[PDB]
Amino acid sequence: MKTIIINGVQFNTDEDTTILKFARDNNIDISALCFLNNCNNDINKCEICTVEVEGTGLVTACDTLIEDGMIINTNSDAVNEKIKSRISQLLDIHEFKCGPCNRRENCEFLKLVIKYKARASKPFLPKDKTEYVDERSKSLTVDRTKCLLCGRCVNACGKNTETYAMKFLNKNGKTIIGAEDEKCFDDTNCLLCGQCIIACPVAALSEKSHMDRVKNALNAPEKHVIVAMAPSVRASIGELFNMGFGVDVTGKIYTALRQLGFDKIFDINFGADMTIMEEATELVQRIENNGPFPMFTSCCPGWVRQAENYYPELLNNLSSAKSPQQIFGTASKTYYPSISGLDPKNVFTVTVMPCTSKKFEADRPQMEKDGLRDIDAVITTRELAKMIKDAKIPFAKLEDSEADPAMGEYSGAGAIFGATGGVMEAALRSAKDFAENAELEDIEYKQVRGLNGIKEAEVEINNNKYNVAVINGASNLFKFMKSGMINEKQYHFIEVMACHGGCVNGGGQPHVNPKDLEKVDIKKVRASVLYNQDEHLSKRKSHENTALVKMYQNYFGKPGEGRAHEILHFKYK
Ligand code: SF4
Ligand code: SF4
Ligand code: SF4
Ligand code: SF4
Ligand code: FES
Ligand SMILES: [Cl-]
Ligand SMILES: [Mg+2]
Ligand SMILES: [Mg+2]
């Protein structure tokens, strides 16, 4: 056993763990900054977690294991002096102007500055702020006037994606973070998934803003602005209005969007049902033609970029169905004018996404037809929250309203898209009915749900057995391929999400304090909202969506054929 003294208190423990973890488990406060995801910044450690160990001196609690005999002090003057000094030195390289800053209300660094009453020795007031900012990407932006060089984004990129597309760089003799060779992220192997943003404790990493695109369209007299939110938004955005975690705020969102001036309130879950119509039809076709196998989902643009950059030989195996965002957008410029009288050129289609990579997808040159973009702007969950707050809309006290039904109705299958395994489960519900020409009652595929990184199942479709896999996070895609797991059997249908947990954990989602992440499983609680909707919806299959059925009957025809196949599909070359 080990006997540990912390701040005069004796502990007897068998645990093999760090001082930081042991202290935290025993209600002893130790600050941290560069420690996250069970890693710290191994070179140029932040030292905010400093403690004193008798007989050794000052040590970093976050990467020092407890040893029998240690006597530790976490709150001596020497300790607080050192921590304050490191915060002061960070302020010397930080444009400390919180007023207009997009992390003003939830900044980890600000909290530490306040906790230790630190001040800069010489305030940093960049003039060529141009020099510190990189806005070239369609999805990410960097503001180095805020960057603490804490490495959390580099560590998060490595762990979440294994691309190491975010790097430390030596730029004219100063250390920065950025992409390979200081290129635009979009021109590197980066997936544009934004996990580096989620990991950042300050406003040094952000999404590429579309808020001006949106406001300009809202204010243009002749534009008719459609808005449609992703599955995950309704499970998440309430966090930023102090409503807590796991709160379903669907109806409040619809009201807020009307109060912001949007002209039509639809829902990307309608697009999710459309993607299932096309993709489940495609799966049945591929079964009847014995391939090609495996078919991969094509709805996650982080995964599409991963395939493009590392597995281009798989691009032809991706489903040709457009993603819910792009398939909805295509219909918003074709079907929707046909049922409304709008001039298609005057329709401006906005989505709200938990995702930064969706901005790149929407701006792909060929995601348009007859000069009309499928999707004209994409705002993240965070961006919508800012728009609501800037307009002084009292979100938490809004009454519930409904979407406009024509492209707004959704089934429970579409509702679960935002969780890892949701697309797989939704697609199987329709594919099995399609293949067996039946209306089956057992529709729940629990085996593909949850947070395991690589999940598989055998499913029986029309009296034959098929193998499916759900790949949960970009790093797990690499593991699945490089390990040869793909070779252990013939897989027929594989879901891939780049963000572990699915889109509920996407790079456009609300930041969560690392100490809130110790008390809340964010991936599970956000997903729970979506499964709950599925459980209480009357229609739980995409092909039972009444508004969608009318759309195919009256405009697109049979899925996966004819008109449907000509404009609702996309292949990467
Ligand atoms: S990143 Fe945090 S400390 Fe820095 S200016 Fe923004 S809110 Fe203030
Ligand atoms: S967007 Fe994703 S892949 Fe690109 S640097 Fe950030 S974490 Fe890495
Ligand atoms: S961008 Fe953010 S996470 Fe990355 S080193 Fe700078 S402060 Fe840390
Ligand atoms: S998992 Fe969802 S949020 Fe993450 S990159 Fe893919 S589409 Fe975007
Ligand atoms: S938090 Fe321990 S060195 Fe940064
Ligand atoms: Cl309508
Ligand atoms: Mg370390
Ligand atoms: Mg307007």
Author numbering: 1 to 573
Please quote the authors directly.
pmcHydrogenases are metalloenzymes that catalyze the interconversion between protons (H+), electrons (e−) and hydrogen (H2). Among them, [FeFe]‐hydrogenases exhibit the highest activity for both H2 production and oxidation. Their catalytic cofactor, termed H‐cluster, consists of a [4Fe4S] sub‐cluster ([4Fe]H) and a diiron moiety ([2Fe]H) bridged through a cysteine residue. The amine base is connected to the protein surface through a conserved proton transfer pathway (PTP) for rapid H+ shuttling.
Two crystals of 1.39 Å and 1.5 Å, termed CpI‐CN−‐1 and CpI‐CN−‐2 in the following, were analyzed in depth. They were compared to two structures of CO‐treated CpI for which we obtained higher resolutions (1.34 Å and 1.52 Å; termed Hox‐CO‐1 and Hox‐CO‐2 hereafter) than previously reported. The four newly obtained structures feature strong electron densities at the OCS at Fed that are not present in the structure of untreated CpI. The refined occupancies indicate that the OCS is fully occupied by an extrinsic ligand in CN−‐treated CpI, whereas only 71 to 93 % of the OCS of CO‐treated crystals hold an extrinsic ligand. The latter is possibly due to an insufficient partial pressure of CO in the crystallization wells. CO binds to the OCS of the H‐cluster, and CO and CN− are isoelectronic, making it challenging to distinguish them by electron density analysis. To the best of our knowledge, conformational changes of PTP residues have never been observed in structures of untreated CpI wild type proteins. They are also absent from three independently prepared structures obtained by CO treatment as well as from the sulfide (SH−) ‐bound Desulfovibrio desulfuricans [FeFe]‐hydrogenase.
